[PDB]
Copies of this chain bind each other. A is one copy, B any other.
Amino acid sequence: SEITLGRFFFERLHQLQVDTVFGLPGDFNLALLDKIYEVDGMRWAGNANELNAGYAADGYARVNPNGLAALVSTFGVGENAIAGSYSEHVGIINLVGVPSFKNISQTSAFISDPNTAASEIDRCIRDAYVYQRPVYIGLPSNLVDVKVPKSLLDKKIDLSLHPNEPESQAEVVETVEKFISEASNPVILVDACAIRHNCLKEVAELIAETQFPVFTTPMGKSSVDESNPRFGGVYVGSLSSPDVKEAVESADLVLSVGAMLRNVVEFHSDYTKIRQATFPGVQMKEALQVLLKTVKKSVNPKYVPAPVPPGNNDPVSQEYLWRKVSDWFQEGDVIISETGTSAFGIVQSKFPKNAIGISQVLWGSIGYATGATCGAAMAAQEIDPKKRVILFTGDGSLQLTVQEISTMCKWDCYNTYLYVLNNDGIQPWNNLQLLPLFNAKKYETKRISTVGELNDLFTNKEFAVPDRIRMVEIMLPVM
């Protein structure tokens, strides 16, 4: 009828669907790791080191329904994976084991008093979920085995947003709708925070009710079904295609949604911005819901919905890969991209419906995508066995966090595709040797030099089934 404090933690993670814990086993948390095997459904990923585990945790959080992941660390050795998690808003629950970086984590919690310990853990899990940012939880070894009532688990953690103050909300939905009426050629622009703070149906509803052109950032790619006839591509300012650059920069009204950072309405998590006016406390989620109720009637200044944008033996070019990759993708696919050729190549690729984008371009922490893939893989397993997890990475980037491919093998992650873009770089490795070396129970490797080989692979129906873990090495020119 009373449970250990250590167990309470893992039982809370289970309630919020976080059924994989990342980290490297270490002294002062070993007692805590025993608790995992008391909770039915939990598993210990067992990563090579902590840096890798943080990447893994991040990836896992981007695929978790609640946007949450659990990472265990230890004093000293145990602690950048969290520095780049914070700046890209991902709710990693950090539990540091301490004996018996307040900048790059939302709320610190030091569990000294076993009376308020449960409450302190709950406050941190809530803050992780709501604000979608990392959260440190200090737990001394002596306290991991302190009994607390099992009834504490029945009082489920409140994860509700504090309602927007009606006045500021009313003033924003009023003003925004005025600009919409004035707007000749409005556009919608969706960035990552739209994905993060769960505003994708809202964005879908907004595209329908306005019939405005919609574009995403690289970081906000997969926020919008790219088969939507209102989708007009990926804006990257100067580096955008001339036709996409035109459509966005021609607009007199931009409805920016979740912009991380003319008539510009920027919807943010904590606040809303209209031109140079800032309305602090106006959270986008509710703002957008209240907007959709009446947005239809605002958009009728006689607006006309605006229109929106190699030889089989020849070596596979960047251009040809990213266009033809579109044909192979399917609904629900986790598309992961590494900083480098992959991160900007994948931009031009067309994504399927309910696609999940994971491309650390903003923080650009080399090795992340391979690390992250391990987390996304394990999260997909727990969600939907048919859900495929595809990685595009340079051969170099792979090396830094290579051991997390062993983790994928250990947990029979038969949903993951490991596309390794080789371009002569570093120390060259026989990358196709990794899966058999790491002892994947079921696997397939394939080198691809020419267009013909690539076209076969994607049209191959048996290859498209996640029945085994695969690594496809794609040879590219030194350029």
Contacts and interface: CB of A to CB of B under 8 A. Distances in A.
A299 interface: no
B437 A430 contact: yes
A406 B433 contact: no
A407 interface: yes
A427 B439 contact: yes
A310 interface: no
A436 B427 contact: no
Please tell me the size bucket of the interface on A. Answer: 20 to 34
A261 interface: no
B434 A437 contact: yes
Interface stretch (A11-19, A43-51, A193-201): A43-51
The residue among A24, A426, A438 with the most chain B CB atoms within 10 A of its own CB is A438
Contacts of A437: 429-430, 433-434, 437
A43 to B, nearest CB: 14
A479 interface: no
Contact of A400 (B49, B427, B428): B49
Contacts of A24: 366, 400
A406 B407 CA distance: 20
Nearest to A79: B80
Contacts of A365: 77
Given A24-B400, A51-B49, A400-B48, A427 B438 contact: yes
A211 interface: no
Given A49-B51, A51-B51, A365-B77, A427 B399 contact: no
Contacts of A4: none
A365 to B, nearest CB: 6
Contact of A429 (B366, B429, B438): B438
Given A433-B437, A439-B429, A403 B406 contact: no
Interface in A412-458: 426-430, 433-434, 436-439
A409 interface: yes
A409 B430 CA distance: 13
Interface string A370-395: 00000000000000000000000000
Contact of A49 (B367, B409, B428): B367
A312 B116 CA distance: 63
A426 B411 CA distance: 11
Nearest 8 A-B pairs (CB), nearest first?
A: A410-B427, A433-B437, A76-B83, A430-B437, A406-B427, A48-B400, A77-B365, A428-B439
Given A49-B49, A407-B427, A427-B439, 18 more contacts: A24-B366, A46-B426, A48-B399, A48-B402, A49-B400, A49-B401, A50-B51, A51-B51, A399-B403, A402-B402, A402-B403, A406-B427, A406-B429, A410-B427, A428-B439, A429-B437, A429-B438, A430-B439
